[PDB]
Design a protein around this ligand. Structure first.
Ligand SMILES: [Zn+2]
Ligand SMILES: [Zn+2]
Lengths: 54, 138, 83, 157, 171, 47
């Protein structure tokens, strides 16, 4: 919400009311600088050790 | 007394007296908690109770309801010597004369200890304590 | 909390994003000296080798599809129908 | 400190890797040597299995044969074996079972009985001074008896 | 104290170690890093019990670099010092501030001020030894030290001991 | 005690009592009153 327009007011109300953020939003993951759940990053890639012996 | 209970903490009545005042059996001197804890916590040294030089050891304290140092020492030595002698030459057969004579000897020993005499008979009483302990071990 | 194999109700087809990340991660491993499971026809580029392994389903990976309620599923890329 | 109040991971309540509750395992310097020296043997069997396809000399020689097993990065464990062996008077796990039978008979804390079995004392005042947690939790005559039976269980090897 | 605790560690593997035998490699790494090292939370790790039934759980791929991350739960024998703990040791290095007692893998230090008054430092001897009124503290001599405090820094643990109190000193 | 009317003026808060006695509320007084706030009070406000 703070990213769009009124940054300082939203931040001040957030800190005042002890607000918590889930941090799965788009802009949130952008600001923190790591992978977001969009497209390629909307799923994790794993490894199966039982498949290496195939 | 309410005016002497620790050379550093002699008047703690208006400071909420919530600390106890321990007494070491080798000094017979009152020391408050925060002082004695540092005393035996920094090492077994003597307390400065009016220039006291007898070393205060770690732990081995006691609570005192105050019955004067004379009677407290006489009851501590009385109980200790009573345990050293145990029931030797006492309730062995039922005699009353020799029993009262032996009790007279024990009370005379405790008397010589509480009076000290000349630091000569009391040492013989200590050797008597070692002999009685050797008899109780066997 | 890991939905079992008899209750996996997601699409069995591999999406373009799953194929993309599988070819990207697999090609990245091949570039980092990974054991190749397919005989090469003379290729040098790692992406072509990754697509060669995807064409024969020799890629040893399994996808953990996250569900919106917090759960997930394990769809191996060998059982996923490509294209 | 030493007031029966350890850290978080060293609390009386422990949890194994299966999820069950387990009491804190406290070991004295007697079976603690037979457990390291014990597991190193099966570790040597595990190292020689995949390979197919007087009291001080044996200690250092076995520590060398086990040093060849490891990658030469854990010699402080062998020096710890020399420390324990130089400070150990017990032997054989049967006698150790008897020692646990004598320590658990009083109903004390595992750390307390560990400090009891790990220290060599002759009187009860020694055990009460070296162990600040034990001063009134158990009788002195019983501690002297435990030290007597232990004194009969120790043998110069 | 020599305790036994179940520890968990995250092992990182290079993509070149993804052979069918990789499990062995895991155990290999699980030894090379854990045995001999030290942690500020569990103390000096001595040995690792149960080598056959080592749980592998499931390996996860982190984003960049492509390295593999594993969460291993095992049982290990570790050594953790404690404050106010009577231990025994042998001197190694000597200093004017005090002799450095060696207790297992830990090198405890005893301050000169934490020593009785009769124990004096002697530098004229080779090696310099602490001579008292009855006991002579030398390198090869065995001394029972009561640890007063311990420091739990990451991968480094040092403790401070004393022998001023009764029933202590040379063995 | 009659609760005054708090008005904002020049980065300050002036309190008006009708009883009229108007007194300016200082920062130390407001902070004291805030120090006497119970848990249910400010947690009922959104803190
Ligand atoms: Zn005082
Ligand atoms: Zn005194």
């Amino acid at each position: 919400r703070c990213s769009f327009e009124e940054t300082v007011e939203i931040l001040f109300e957030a800190g005042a009311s002890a607000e918590l953020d889930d941090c799965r939003g788009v802009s949130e993951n952008v600001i923190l600088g790591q992978m977001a759940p969009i497209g390629t990053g909307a799923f994790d890639v794993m490894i199966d050790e039982e498949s290496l012996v195939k | 007394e309410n005016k002497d209970m620790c050379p550093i903490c002699k008047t703690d009545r208006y400071l909420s007296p919530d600390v106890k005042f321990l007494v070491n059996p080798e000094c017979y001197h009152r020391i408050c908690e925060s002082c004695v804890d540092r005393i035996f916590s920094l090492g077994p040294a003597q307390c400065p109770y009016k220039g006291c030089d007898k070393i205060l050891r770690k732990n081995k304290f006691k609570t005192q309801i105050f019955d004067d140092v004379e009677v407290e020492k006489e009851v501590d030595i009385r109980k200790r010597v009573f345990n050293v002698f145990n029931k030797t030459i006492d309730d062995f057969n039922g005699d009353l004369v020799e029993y009262n004579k032996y009790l007279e000897e024990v009370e005379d020993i405790i008397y010589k200890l509480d009076h000290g005499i000349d630091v000569a008979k009391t040492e013989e009483k200590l050797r008597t304590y070692e002999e009685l302990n050797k008899q109780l071990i066997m | 909390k890991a939905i079992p194999k008899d209750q996996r109700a997601t699409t069995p087809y591999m999406t373009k994003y799953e194929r993309a990340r599988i070819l990207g991660t697999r090609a990245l491993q091949i570039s980092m000296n990974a054991p190749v499971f397919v005989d090469l026809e003379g290729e040098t580029d790692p992406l072509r080798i990754a697509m060669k392994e995807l064409a024969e389903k020799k890629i040893p990976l399994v996808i953990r599809r996250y569900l919106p309620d917090g759960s997930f599923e394990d769809w191996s890329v060998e059982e996923l129908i490509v294209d | 400190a030493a007031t029966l109040q350890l850290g978080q991971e060293f609390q009386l309540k422990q949890i194994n890797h299966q999820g069950e509750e387990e009491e804190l395992i406290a070991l004295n310097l007697s079976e603690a040597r037979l457990v390291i020296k014990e597991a190193l043997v099966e570790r040597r069997r595990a190292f020689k299995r995949s390979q197919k396809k007087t009291r001080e000399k044996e200690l250092e020689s076995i520590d060398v044969l086990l040093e060849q097993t490891t990658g030469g990065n854990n010699k402080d464990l062998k020096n710890t074996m020399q420390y324990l062996t130089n400070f150990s008077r017990f032997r054989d796990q049967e006698t150790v079972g008897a020692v646990i039978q004598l320590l658990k008979s009083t109903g004390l804390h595992p750390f307390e009985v560990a400090q009891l079995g790990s220290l060599a004392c002759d009187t009860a005042d020694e055990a009460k001074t070296l162990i600040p947690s034990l001063n009134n939790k158990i009788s002195d005559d019983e501690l002297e008896r435990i030290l007597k039976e232990l004194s009969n269980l120790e043998t110069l090897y | 104290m020599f305790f036994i605790k179940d520890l968990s560690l995250n092992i990182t593997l290079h993509p070149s170690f993804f052979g069918p035998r990789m499990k062995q490699y895991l155990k290999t790494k699980l030894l090379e890093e854990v045995e001999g090292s030290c942690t500020g939370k569990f103390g000096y790790i001595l040995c690792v019990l149960d080598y056959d039934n080592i749980d592998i759980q499931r390996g996860r791929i982190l984003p960049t670099d492509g390295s593999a991350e594993f969460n291993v739960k095992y049982r290990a024998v570790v050594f953790k010092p404690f404050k106010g703990e009577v231990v025994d040791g042998t001197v190694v290095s000597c200093s004017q501030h005090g002799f450095e007692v060696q207790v297992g893998p830990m090198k405890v230090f005893v301050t000169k001020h934490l020593m009785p008054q009769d124990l004096t430092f002697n530098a004229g001897s080779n090696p310099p030894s602490y001579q008292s009124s009855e006991d002579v503290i030398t390198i090869k001599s065995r001394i029972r030290v009561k640890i007063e405090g311990c420091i739990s820094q990451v991968s480094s643990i040092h403790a401070i001991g004393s022998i001023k109190e009764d029933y202590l000193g040379a063995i | 005690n009659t609760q005054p009317t708090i008005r904002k003026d020049g980065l300050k808060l002036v309190g008006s009592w009708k009883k009229p006695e108007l007194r300016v509320l200082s920062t130390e007084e407001i902070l004291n009153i805030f120090k006497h706030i119970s848990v249910k009070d400010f947690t009922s406000l959104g803190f």
